[PDB]
């Protein structure tokens, strides 16, 4: 009984692991998207100040 | 999860009362129904209440029971009347909430 | 409103046949528990 | 501002709706894990009494 | 919309439970009706 | 007032009207010398389940367009040989058709 | 307008997170339904054997 | 013995999931901070365009 239950629990844990790894990598990528927006915004602020 | 406390009990030589109150989601249950749980043998339903008042029953107890909600204590009223004393059984009340099914603690009553 | 009424009625009936079935089958339990025990 | 507040309210509504959906789906996952557990112990017991 | 979702989930619950009852008890008919007649 | 005419390893029925305005409908199996028995269930949702005997065996599908429901026989062992009748439920009513039979093997 | 569009950003983001999580939750409901079916099959076989 | 080993691996995996939970929550906060600066930079763009 307890090998079966512990086995199911560890399958749960594994699945949550790959899902959350995908989440971590996706939020990293989305963070670089925000970073690119910020860079463009800084360039726009620069040209705005000079104008 | 919704917890369920029940009532009932006693022993006399025709009528007795049994109502279980839910722990949360008061008036938050569509189908509620008590099951009879006789010893040894398996478990089976006795009466139902929809979310709104209609009440089908088991043929074994038609007219013998009244089942009726009470949103005051979320205690559907499973009323035992004109009991045939052989009909004793542990009584657990069920709740089907949000597609999930929640079980009571069971209660045994007998008279005569 | 119309759809919720219709679905409510389906709950009604499905509950009714559930009751009848569980009843005739409790009767089956009783008779056949005797007839094997 | 009219356009932006419209979008603000709209996405807020949709976020609340999918919040309710996540709550109910997580509750359903908990229910199914409990049910699968029950299957596990009772199946073990039956398969062993049958041995 | 919440009410229709709730009641519909209850519909699936009743459907599944009624199916389980029908199955077990058709099996009961089969088995013990053969052991009796 | 609804009529469910049958058809039909693949069998179907058509309703009078209002498919998917028709809530829960299911099919039933009548083994000979036996009493009534449910088979499989489609809902308005497309939520679906079977009975334990035919679990895995049969498959059921709804076509919203042409007022119909579907049952497809699968890997049948003759034991399922019976006469089948397709059922539906409408605002608290029965609805039964004429049904049709299936044979050995 | 500044803070309204900021709230737009935040709500839209957390809404995307809710949507992907609900995707996962429906997927896992599907998976637990499948495994419950597998337990049902094995547990019907090792119930007929017991009978 | 299998239960012992698999319980060990489950302990290791739950340690990993806790650490990666820490990582993902931290990255969520960090993305939130960059989002606030995005809002400020876009507002500065807007005001400069107005001027």
Numbering used by the authors:
A (entry chain A), H (entry chain B): 155 to 205
B (entry chain W): 1 to 13, 789 to 887
C (entry chain U), E (entry chain V): 410 to 446
D (entry chain D), G (entry chain C): 308 to 358
F (entry chain X): 1 to 8, 791 to 887
From the primary publication:
Crescentin is a coiled coil protein that is required for the crescent cell shape of bacteria such as Caulobacter crescentus. Crescentin shares biochemical and cytoskeletal properties with intermediate filament (IF) proteins, which form the third major class of cytoskeletal proteins in eukaryotes. To better understand the relationship between crescentin and IF proteins, and the filaments they form, we have determined the three-dimensional structure of crescentin filaments by cryo-EM. This revealed the full-length structure of the parallel coiled coil dimer of crescentin and how dimers come together laterally and longitudinally, to form a non-polar, octameric filament.
CreSsat contains a stretch of three amino acids (Ser, Ala, and Thr; SAT), inserted before residue 406, to remove the stutter that locally disrupts the continuity of the heptad-repeat coiled coil. Crescentin also contains a stutter (residues 406–409), and we have investigated the consequences of removing it by reverting the repeat pattern back to regular heptad repeats by inserting three residues, Ser, Ala, and Thr (SAT), before position 406 (9). Cryo-EM analysis revealed that for both versions of CreS, purified CreS-MB13 complex at pH 8 polymerizes into regular, unbundled filaments upon lowering the pH to 6.5 in the presence of detergents, such as CHAPS. We next extended the box size to ~960 Å (referred to as “large box”) for the visualization of a more complete CreS structure, which included regions that are distant from the NB13 binding site, which was mapped to a segment near the C terminus of CreS. The best small box and large box reconstructions were of CreSsat complexed with NB13, determined at nominal resolutions of 3.34 Å (3.79 Å against the fitted atomic model) and 4.11 Å (4.75 Å against the fitted atomic model), respectively. In the presence of MB13, CreSwt, and CreSsat similarly assemble into a “supertwist”-like filament, where two intertwined strands, I and II, are related by a two-fold axis perpendicular to the filament axis. When looking at the map down this twofold axis, each strand consists of four partial CreS dimers (dimers A, B, C, and D for strand I, and symmetry-related dimers A’, B’, C’, and D’ for strand II) within a viewing window of ~960-Å wide along the filament. Assembly of a nearly complete CreS dimer (residues 31–446 for CreSsat or 31–443 for CreSwt) was possible through symmetry expansion, based on the observed partial dimers A and B, resulting in an atomic model of the strand. The structures of the WT and SAT versions are very similar, except that the SAT version is slightly longer because the helices contain one almost complete extra helical turn. While it has been reported that such a modification abolishes crescentin’s ability to curve cells, we have found little evidence that it changes its behavior in vitro.
